Amino acid sequence: LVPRGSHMLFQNVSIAGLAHIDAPHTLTSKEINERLQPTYDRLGIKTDVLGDVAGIHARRLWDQDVQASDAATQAARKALIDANIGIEKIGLLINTSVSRDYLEPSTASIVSGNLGVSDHCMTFDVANACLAFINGMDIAARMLERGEIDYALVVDGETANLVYEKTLERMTSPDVTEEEFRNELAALTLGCGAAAMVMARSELVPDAPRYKGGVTRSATEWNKLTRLLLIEGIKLAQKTFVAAKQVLGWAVEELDQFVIHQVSRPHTAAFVKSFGIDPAKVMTIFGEHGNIGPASVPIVLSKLKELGRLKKGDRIALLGIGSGLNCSMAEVVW
Amino acid sequence: LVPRGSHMLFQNVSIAGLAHIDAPHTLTSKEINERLQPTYDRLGIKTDVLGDVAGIHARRLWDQDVQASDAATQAARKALIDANIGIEKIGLLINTSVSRDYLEPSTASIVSGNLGVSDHCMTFDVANACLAFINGMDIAARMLERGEIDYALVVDGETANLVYEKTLERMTSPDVTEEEFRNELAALTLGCGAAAMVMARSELVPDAPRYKGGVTRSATEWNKLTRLLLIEGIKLAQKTFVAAKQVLGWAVEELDQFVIHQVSRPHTAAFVKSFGIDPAKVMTIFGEHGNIGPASVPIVLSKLKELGRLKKGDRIALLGIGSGLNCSMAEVVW
Ligand SMILES: C/C=C/C/C=C/CCC(=O)[C@@H](O)CC(N)=O
Ligand SMILES: C/C=C/C/C=C/CCC(=O)[C@@H](O)CC(N)=O
Ligand SMILES: [Mn+2]
Ligand SMILES: [Mn+2]
């Protein structure tokens, strides 16, 4: 009768499989700058904003015209192998990417057709900027917990190639203003990649990492959003941490790894300092892969898994601040 | 221990409030044809495909540059009044529209900011062509059933004005082929409008209509999709009806109303005939409002409610075939 924080946590949801795809092509910020240099000089800007300010040394792009659905499919095939299960077991496939093949059908339906899902497989896309993979995990978890399905795929493929192409053209225009030039620099922090996760009912996969679920707080009063954005983002993260304390029992010092969505080196620095987080517990791929949107979190988690340092029982915080503004925080126990 | 179909149905989820917005501006197919006539003649086509074939006599457009979020917000304000609750009670807001303000943030976050949701309100968009409102209802229902939230908004605003503007220009081009002309005619079956629903835990709203949930089947092998589309759509609907029998206990003759997504008059005729459905139990707004995408179903349900014929206990089938292909069928008991 009496609510407790722990009551809303998932007790029977696990991560059966996890995979990521690294986009193959390294575009260094050094190479990008060589092309921007004339516009940098002309504008009188001495600042290597990419390398020294945003803190990105390289990002990965696709070599070919990869669609979001292609990248998500490739990650999903790899995640199924990691879980050692066939596609026929999948009862739900959710796509969470910002990148999108078409207006219709859903990117999820395209990935599902590529994989050969059965006619029982439910599919749809969830869109929520950089936080959507966590949303997708939670939506799948609720179906798993209820027993409506036994296995789910959550997938996310991102492609920035076209954004880079268009952006580099506008920024090297003879009539580009320093303002426009600045406003467009931010696209050059984006990167390509993909991730997929197979979630399952725990009884089917004893000893797999457990997904506990988590919390969300919002500040939709700031859906218009500068230094103001960082300030409001941090304030929202503060209230979300309170919610995490109340539901997950989180105390910063008791978490073993923080898998954090990253916007830039300085944004991450400010977040980490604000909450007293130990930098050594924050794996970052931003410097060499850039910001892969909602795929960033599961790609980092996947990279942590394959590095083999995680121990059974490790408490892993998944979190990010997304446009909205929204903030989500969730826990995996390895 | 032993699964039964009824086990996955929601026992504690109700519809507290429901509203729709009719777009104000009537664009008749007569008026549209007057503009197409020269291209019709030039092409030698005697067929009034819109009125006599698709069976659309008019569609509604917005009078001004209405964004999806504006239309959804207007419907949501109306649905809150119908439920007699303030926005502060809402713990989740899902947007399900095809129409989209921006790439980011979510349309849901924009609507939520407009309405003044609290910081506890979770928000995201679900995209699944014409079936997404049903998906959103189900996602909200699972949170309500678990007790994670007490009230949810599911919203959907659609705008086709720009599609109409661009389409009418391409179809009246001196060099337009009969093929292209045909391929583009289909956009002229779309209409504008909005709908919103407040869902709630049943104990908070005794005597409100109950949402039981439903089933989905897919045929993602046909995600590429002609007469073939109608054929495959019907085959998928047949398998979904079997699932509905197995879960909801559906027999066609025992349902009181069918609220069906509509693609065209003949598509609807073929569907209704295939399943032996009584036309008198199928409210249609397509002839005067066209196809409002994923808002079509809740708009028709809302219009049924305000007409006041529904009786406590009436069994209402919600269904549609969406691109994917997907098919979803769900039940409301009034
Ligand atoms: C730590 C402060 C963070 C400020 C938030 C910035 C928004 C970030 C982005 O624009 C993308 O990286 C992801 C997103 N908005 O969902
Ligand atoms: C009865 C047969 C139906 C064929 C299906 C056609 C697809 C319909 C549409 O294209 C939109 O109206 C909605 C949608 N595709 O989700
Ligand atoms: Mn290369
Ligand atoms: Mn008018």
Side-chain angles (χ1 to χ4, degrees), chain A residues 1-174 176-334, chain B residues 1-174 176-334:
Chain A
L1 306 181
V2 178
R4 289 302 301 280
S6 71
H7 285 175
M8 284 311 151
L9 299 184
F10 303 113
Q11 313 299 328
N12 195 36
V13 178
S14 297
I15 300 179
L18 178 57
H20 69 276
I21 301 302
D22 290 328
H25 184 91
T26 308
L27 174 55
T28 66
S29 303
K30 181 169 178 293
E31 179 177 8
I32 282 179
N33 284 336
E34 298 178 17
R35 181 171 177 183
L36 291 178
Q37 206 56 58
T39 309
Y40 259 144
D41 292 348
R42 185 181 69 80
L43 291 175
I45 314 311
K46 270 92 171 60
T47 309
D48 171 15
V49 330
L50 287 181
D52 290 330
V53 177
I56 178 169
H57 168 274
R59 79 279 299 129
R60 298 292 188 91
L61 303 177
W62 304 108
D63 276 318
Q64 307 170 346
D65 299 338
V66 173
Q67 294 185 297
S69 64
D70 298 324
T73 295
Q74 184 176 23
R77 291 202 205 275
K78 205 168 165 194
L80 290 169
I81 286 167
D82 187 63
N84 197 17
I85 62 152
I87 191 61
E88 72 280 354
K89 292 290 185 41
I90 301 299
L92 167 71
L93 188 152
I94 300 182
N95 173 84
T96 64
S97 64
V98 168
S99 300
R100 192 174 177 174
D101 285 35
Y102 298 110
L103 183 278
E104 88 171 12
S106 71
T107 297
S109 70
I110 301 173
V111 175
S112 296
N114 294 342
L115 297 175
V117 303
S118 78
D119 61 15
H120 287 50
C121 190
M122 179 186 303
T123 67
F124 49 83
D125 294 341
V126 173
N128 188 23
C130 296
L131 299 187
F133 201 93
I134 297 172
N135 301 134
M137 289 173 67
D138 288 331
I139 291 162
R142 294 192 198 86
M143 298 188 66
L144 292 158
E145 189 87 346
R146 273 192 98 219
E148 285 175 67
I149 58 176
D150 296 323
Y151 292 90
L153 268 165
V154 185
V155 307
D156 191 310
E158 301 298 343
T159 170
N161 283 57
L162 231 299
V163 174
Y164 271 79
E165 197 182 309
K166 297 170 294 188
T167 290
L168 287 179
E169 292 180 351
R170 296 193 296 259
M171 295 183 320
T172 57
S173 173
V176 71
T177 75
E178 178 168 348
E179 175 187 12
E180 296 161 344
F181 185 90
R182 288 267 182 60
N183 180 39
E184 296 190 345
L185 268 162
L188 302 181
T189 63
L190 300 181
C192 298
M197 176 183 293
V198 177
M199 303 174 77
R201 288 177 56 82
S202 298
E203 78 266 1
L204 300 178
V205 288
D207 179 78
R210 170 173 174 227
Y211 178 66
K212 300 184 92 170
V215 297
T216 291
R217 289 290 178 269
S218 57
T220 53
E221 61 268 28
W222 294 109
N223 77 75
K224 304 180 179 184
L225 301 177
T226 55
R227 302 173 184 178
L228 185 56
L229 180 48
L230 173 64
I231 295 307
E232 292 303 329
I234 301 297
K235 287 157 70 166
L236 180 57
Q238 171 186 15
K239 60 172 58 176
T240 312
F241 265 118
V242 170
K245 174 191 71 178
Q246 300 172 339
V247 173
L248 288 158
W250 279 10
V252 169
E253 68 277 10
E254 294 176 2
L255 298 166
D256 298 294
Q257 294 292 331
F258 297 81
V259 177
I260 307 181
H261 175 267
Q262 297 198 211
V263 178
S264 76
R265 177 177 60 198
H267 282 87
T268 297
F271 181 92
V272 165
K273 173 177 178 176
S274 169
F275 299 119
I277 293 169
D278 181 2
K281 298 177 184 293
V282 181
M283 177 169 179
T284 169
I285 63 165
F286 179 83
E288 307 298 330
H289 291 261
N291 171 7
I292 316 175
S296 306
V297 159
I299 292 170
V300 167
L301 182 63
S302 183
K303 284 173 173 291
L304 280 174
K305 171 165 86 62
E306 75 179 19
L307 284 172
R309 298 282 161 182
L310 298 171
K311 287 170 269 51
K312 201 68 177 56
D314 279 355
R315 304 181 66 191
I316 305 175
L318 308 185
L319 64 87
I321 297 163
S323 296
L325 299 172
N326 293 288
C327 180
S328 295
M329 297 182 178
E331 182 178 340
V332 172
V333 182
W334 207 245
Chain B
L1 306 181
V2 178
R4 289 302 301 280
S6 71
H7 285 175
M8 284 311 151
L9 299 184
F10 303 113
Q11 313 299 328
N12 195 36
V13 178
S14 297
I15 300 179
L18 178 57
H20 69 276
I21 301 302
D22 290 328
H25 184 91
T26 308
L27 174 55
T28 66
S29 303
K30 181 169 178 293
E31 179 177 8
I32 282 179
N33 284 336
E34 298 178 17
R35 181 171 177 183
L36 291 178
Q37 206 56 58
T39 309
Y40 259 144
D41 292 348
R42 185 181 69 80
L43 291 175
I45 314 311
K46 270 92 171 60
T47 309
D48 171 15
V49 330
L50 287 181
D52 290 330
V53 177
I56 178 169
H57 168 274
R59 79 279 299 129
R60 298 292 188 91
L61 303 177
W62 304 108
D63 276 318
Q64 307 170 346
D65 299 338
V66 173
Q67 294 185 297
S69 64
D70 298 324
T73 295
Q74 184 176 23
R77 291 202 205 275
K78 205 168 165 194
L80 290 169
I81 286 167
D82 187 63
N84 197 17
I85 62 152
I87 191 61
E88 72 280 354
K89 292 290 185 41
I90 301 299
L92 167 71
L93 188 152
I94 300 182
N95 173 84
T96 64
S97 64
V98 168
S99 300
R100 192 174 177 174
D101 285 35
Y102 298 110
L103 183 278
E104 88 171 12
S106 71
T107 297
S109 70
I110 301 173
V111 175
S112 296
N114 294 342
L115 297 175
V117 303
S118 78
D119 61 15
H120 287 50
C121 190
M122 179 186 303
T123 67
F124 49 83
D125 294 341
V126 173
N128 188 23
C130 296
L131 299 187
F133 201 93
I134 297 172
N135 301 134
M137 289 173 67
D138 288 331
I139 291 162
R142 294 192 198 86
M143 298 188 66
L144 292 158
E145 189 87 346
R146 273 192 98 219
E148 285 175 67
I149 58 176
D150 296 323
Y151 292 90
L153 268 165
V154 185
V155 307
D156 191 310
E158 301 298 343
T159 170
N161 283 57
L162 231 299
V163 174
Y164 271 79
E165 197 182 309
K166 297 170 294 188
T167 290
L168 287 179
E169 292 180 351
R170 296 193 296 259
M171 295 183 320
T172 57
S173 173
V176 71
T177 75
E178 178 168 348
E179 175 187 12
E180 296 161 344
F181 185 90
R182 288 267 182 60
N183 180 39
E184 296 190 345
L185 268 162
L188 302 181
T189 63
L190 300 181
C192 298
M197 176 183 293
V198 177
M199 303 174 77
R201 288 177 56 82
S202 298
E203 78 266 1
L204 300 178
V205 288
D207 179 78
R210 170 173 174 227
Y211 178 66
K212 300 184 92 170
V215 297
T216 291
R217 289 290 178 269
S218 57
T220 53
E221 61 268 28
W222 294 109
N223 77 75
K224 304 180 179 184
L225 301 177
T226 55
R227 302 173 184 178
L228 185 56
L229 180 48
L230 173 64
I231 295 307
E232 292 303 329
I234 301 297
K235 287 157 70 166
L236 180 57
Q238 171 186 15
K239 60 172 58 176
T240 312
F241 265 118
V242 170
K245 174 191 71 178
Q246 300 172 339
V247 173
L248 288 158
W250 279 10
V252 169
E253 68 277 10
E254 294 176 2
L255 298 166
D256 298 294
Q257 294 292 331
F258 297 81
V259 177
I260 307 181
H261 175 267
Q262 297 198 211
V263 178
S264 76
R265 177 177 60 198
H267 282 87
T268 297
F271 181 92
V272 165
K273 173 177 178 176
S274 169
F275 299 119
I277 293 169
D278 181 2
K281 298 177 184 293
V282 181
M283 177 169 179
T284 169
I285 63 165
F286 179 83
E288 307 298 330
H289 291 261
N291 171 7
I292 316 175
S296 306
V297 159
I299 292 170
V300 167
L301 182 63
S302 183
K303 284 173 173 291
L304 280 174
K305 171 165 86 62
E306 75 179 19
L307 284 172
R309 298 282 161 182
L310 298 171
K311 287 170 269 51
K312 201 68 177 56
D314 279 355
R315 304 181 66 191
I316 305 175
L318 308 185
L319 64 87
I321 297 163
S323 296
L325 299 172
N326 293 288
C327 180
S328 295
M329 297 182 178
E331 182 178 340
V332 172
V333 182
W334 207 245

